[PDB]
Amino acid sequence: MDAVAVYHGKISRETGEKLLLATGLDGSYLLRDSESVPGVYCLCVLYHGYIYTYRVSQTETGSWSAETAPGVHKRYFRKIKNLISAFQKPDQGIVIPLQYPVEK
Amino acid sequence: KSLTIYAQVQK
């Protein structure tokens, strides 16, 4: 994602954990590639020493979404930055709002 | 013993 300063590319899960833990701040976050599915990404959010990781995918229409619980209204975003902006807001269904970007 | 918790959006 060339326009997403928090995108670290194909770093390992544990590398991402260590980058977030170095900040020591709940609400720190980054993006990295999925280790499991080509072209999927992981939004990684620090809270209380654990990295809450939300899989983010693009549709054939170009929109982006995060993995959502069964029965919950799933949200689609035109661009990654719009997903990020939405999840900066209080009380949106992730562990803590996205507050402290860990820039590559 | 992983520090990563795969999670889903809840709202």
- CB-nearest partner of A13 from B4, B9, B11: B4
CA distance A9 to chain B (A): 18
Query: How many Å from the N-terminal Cα to the C-terminal Cα in chain A?
Result: 12
Cβ atoms A76, A88 nearer than 8 A:
no
A62: Cα within 13 Å, side-chain hemisphere: 3
* CATH value at residue A94: 3.30.505.10
Tokens standing for A63? 């929109």
Query: With contact defined as beta carbons under 8 Å apart, do A53 and A33 qualify?
Result: no
For residue A74, which phi and psi values (nearest 5 degrees)? -80, 135
Nearest in space to A53 (alpha carbons), one of A65, A69, A67: A67
The enclosing H or E element of A57 equals strand A50-58
Domain hosting A104: range is 1-104
